[PDB]
Amino acid sequence: MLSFQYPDVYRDETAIQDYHGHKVCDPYAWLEDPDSEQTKAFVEAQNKITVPFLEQCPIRGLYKERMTELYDYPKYSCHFKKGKRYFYFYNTGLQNQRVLYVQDSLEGEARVFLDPNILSDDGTVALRGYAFSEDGEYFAYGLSASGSDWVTIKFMKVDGAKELPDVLERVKFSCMAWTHDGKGMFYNAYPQQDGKSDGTETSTNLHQKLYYHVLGTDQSEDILCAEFPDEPKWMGGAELSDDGRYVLLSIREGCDPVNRLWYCDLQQESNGITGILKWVKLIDNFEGEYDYVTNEGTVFTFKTNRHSPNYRLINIDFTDPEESKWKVLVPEHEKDVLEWVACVRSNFLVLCYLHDVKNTLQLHDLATGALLKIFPLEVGSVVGYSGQKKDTEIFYQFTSFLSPGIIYHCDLTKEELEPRVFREVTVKGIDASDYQTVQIFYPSKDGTKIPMFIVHKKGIKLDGSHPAFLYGFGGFNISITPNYSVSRLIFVRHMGGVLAVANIRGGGEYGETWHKGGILANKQNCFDDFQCAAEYLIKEGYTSPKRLTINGGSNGGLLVATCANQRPDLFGCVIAQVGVMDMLKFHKYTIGHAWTTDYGCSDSKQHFEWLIKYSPLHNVKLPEADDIQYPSMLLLTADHDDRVVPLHSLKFIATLQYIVGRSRKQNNPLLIHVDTKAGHGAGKPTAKVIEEVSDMFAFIARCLNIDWIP
């Protein structure tokens, strides 16, 4: 099948570094420079062999045509009210970017408010964050170009959708919060740095500061409100309390669900916001998460995981702040994770729980925490919600593996609090009743039972003949819940596949203990859990090794790349998207320093010893058995992925091709595709999304010799 030659790639055999006595050679270290002629030539040479490989078979075109047809369905976000107007996002179907609409009433005619599509021919300029002023008359929005995390904040007067001159640069990983006096907005920015700041650079991001921008002024006049010069990795995000009296500063360092919480009673400022605020350091440590829900005077309600790994709601009175005095409003559930909480209609709390990786939604009384109403939902996820303290209604969006979903509306001024279907779209071409979703729990190596969702056509014989697509992430307290994917359903319908999602440790499915079970010294549990998921699918007859494809992105890319090295015999195909591959150097670039809370850092001998054992870049090794080769592998990255710098995938593919690709027994391809004007994934235009899934499934089809089923 391989009718191409892998590119020549220079090996710098002198690139040796000592890590606590262990000598590590990094012959492709030069690929860390994205601007060199050598790296640019490497990328061109790799794409030169990958593209024809993906496009040779007619199936890519068949898949692309089908994806373009089926993905073409109306996509709406929940309505949300700001001031006297309603807003909602809507994509007619194939627009590159969804459009923000506005209407003066639910029954009123909607009009385009912000259309990102006119900002670029290819849709590579996308909205990234926004904030309306408290009265809803002004609007701030971030724009990111080519998929970069960098943001430029622009402003508009809502009435007439008038563009304002205010522009904020150097914004990244930023909060956006307007003071209730309507004078300005808090946001975060990074100090100037040498080199580029467009997403192609690898420069580490440190010293993020909190600024206050007064509307109608130049950014140079912005007020510095908080900075942490002695702690370069701290990031402080601001939000205003619901009554506009306090600015709450949530300080994070790393990625664990914990934060310091400082507050500033704005009434107590000597002469408004003129400099560093009079911060009161309520919670001055990183021992727990304190997520603001609402306040009544000095009594603040926070969602927390402090000594509650499944989360709970507590009330902290600023006038009697000691922990021994905090009141538990809604106790922690023994197993269900309290995912998020919102306050609406003054005294109602909307609580969203995760029960065995499925969402539940309910309404509680703010004063007592008592359950008042349960909002019925089918098996799936709540992926959207609207309803702030002053609002008297809520909207929520539900989705699942087999249906785009439903947007519900509930008028909270009605005695019974009954919800109703507000919007429901169905995809013609896919019949949900033809498929089924089952949830099973399989034991991992250490006996821990791991959940796994499996989606397949009803009535299939479990004879191991089906191609399977197994997805996992496993980290950062992220729960992988049901979501609607037309691309995956095409694999099921048109490629006869079985879909599987394994809720391995490291995620947040069973709270902080689930998270801690897949990080630091225990990171291997993630890989073991995932490998065991594959073994379950094989043992139970859903698939066989040669027909199994695994996929993951970012930390999920690390997951599947590590699984390829550790158990090459278990998989037929591996698609690793924007993955962290160099575990010894990840902390050196952009925001990588934040991931040490999940992975550890190689500067530590203890951590290095964990990392070196699974780091994908450092564990590429020819399988010992003559009958075992590496699975077909496709790495997908982009030149503006500043979240996980592309050098990770560049160095990894060079290593795979040299160590494994040169072996005579290796007939499965080891390829990389580096896209342009794209980044980690957020904000990617529809056109690129379609091309990406077409590449993915065409790769699977060609490598596993799978015919298209019309």
Side-chain angles (χ1 to χ4, degrees), residues 470-483:
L470 170 60
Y471 180 86
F473 183 74
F476 301 89
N477 196 46
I478 297 185
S479 293
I480 310 302
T481 62
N483 63 89

Side-chain angles (χ1 to χ4, degrees), residues 127-191:
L127 175 69
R128 191 192 288 275
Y130 63 85
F132 281 85
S133 60
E134 175 62 21
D135 65 6
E137 302 295 356
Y138 284 88
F139 174 75
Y141 62 102
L143 292 179
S144 289
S146 292
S148 170
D149 277 323
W150 285 112
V151 169
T152 293
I153 299 178
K154 291 184 181 184
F155 293 77
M156 291 169 72
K157 180 173 76 165
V158 177
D159 181 30
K162 300 296 180 57
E163 293 286 3
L164 298 180
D166 310 62
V167 175
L168 306 178
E169 301 293 354
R170 304 289 304 157
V171 179
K172 198 183 201 194
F173 309 128
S174 183
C175 65
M176 287 193 209
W178 290 83
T179 43
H180 292 204
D181 61 357
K183 184 173 186 164
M185 190 189 86
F186 288 104
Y187 73 103
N188 296 106
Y190 282 94

Side-chain angles (χ1 to χ4, degrees), residues 138 175 221 231 340 366 375 420 544 577 697:
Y138 284 88
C175 65
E221 304 174 60
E231 293 289 1
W340 57 265
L366 174 60
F375 298 114
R420 67 179 177 97
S544 294
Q577 294 171 263
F697 293 98

Side-chain angles (χ1 to χ4, degrees), residues 579-601:
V580 189
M581 309 306 193
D582 186 338
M583 300 304 297
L584 300 185
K585 300 185 174 183
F586 76 83
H587 63 283
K588 300 183 172 188
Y589 316 109
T590 65
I591 194 56
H593 63 75
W595 313 332
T596 58
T597 48
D598 252 47
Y599 308 136
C601 185

Side-chain angles (χ1 to χ4, degrees), residues 570-701:
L570 211 52
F571 317 105
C573 188
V574 177
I575 299 176
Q577 294 171 263
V578 298
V580 189
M581 309 306 193
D582 186 338
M583 300 304 297
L584 300 185
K585 300 185 174 183
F586 76 83
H587 63 283
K588 300 183 172 188
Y589 316 109
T590 65
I591 194 56
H593 63 75
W595 313 332
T596 58
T597 48
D598 252 47
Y599 308 136
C601 185
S602 61
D603 283 346
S604 154
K605 189 191 191 306
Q606 182 189 24
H607 300 185
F608 172 80
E609 299 302 339
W610 306 330
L611 296 163
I612 198 63
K613 290 182 171 186
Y614 70 82
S615 180
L617 179 61
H618 307 95
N619 286 281
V620 176
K621 183 176 178 172
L622 283 177
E624 292 182 14
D626 290 3
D627 63 336
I628 301 179
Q629 66 178 296
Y630 263 51
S632 293
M633 299 180 73
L634 175 62
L635 306 187
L636 297 180
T637 187
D639 63 3
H640 286 75
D641 184 351
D642 54 359
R643 181 69 64 78
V644 175
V645 289
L647 60 88
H648 282 283
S649 292
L650 306 185
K651 298 203 291 173
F652 186 50
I653 200 67
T655 305
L656 286 165
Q657 292 172 356
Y658 181 78
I659 299 297
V660 180
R662 289 186 309 157
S663 72
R664 297 192 168 286
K665 68 176 176 178
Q666 187 68 32
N667 287 301
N668 289 339
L670 305 165
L671 306 170
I672 185 171
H673 181 262
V674 184
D675 196 24
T676 50
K677 297 190 70 181
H680 203 55
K684 185 173 287 182
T686 302
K688 283 186 177 296
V689 170
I690 292 173
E691 296 299 315
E692 178 170 89
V693 293
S694 298
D695 287 342
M696 290 173 56
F697 293 98
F699 186 70
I700 293 168

Side-chain angles (χ1 to χ4, degrees), residues 389-445:
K389 200 180 185 70
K390 68 176 158 186
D391 293 332
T392 61
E393 69 195 336
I394 58 172
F395 286 90
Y396 52 98
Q397 184 174 195
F398 170 85
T399 187
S400 67
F401 290 119
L402 304 174
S403 163
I406 294 173
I407 291 172
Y408 297 93
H409 171 254
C410 182
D411 179 354
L412 300 174
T413 62
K414 299 294 174 57
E415 191 60 43
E416 299 308 304
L417 311 164
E418 280 290 298
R420 67 179 177 97
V421 171
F422 185 78
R423 176 68 75 174
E424 183 170 9
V425 305
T426 41
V427 177
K428 294 190 59 182
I430 299 297
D431 184 14
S433 52
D434 293 338
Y435 314 97
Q436 67 171 220
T437 294
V438 298
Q439 178 174 54
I440 60 85
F441 299 84
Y442 65 89
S444 185
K445 182 183 175 181

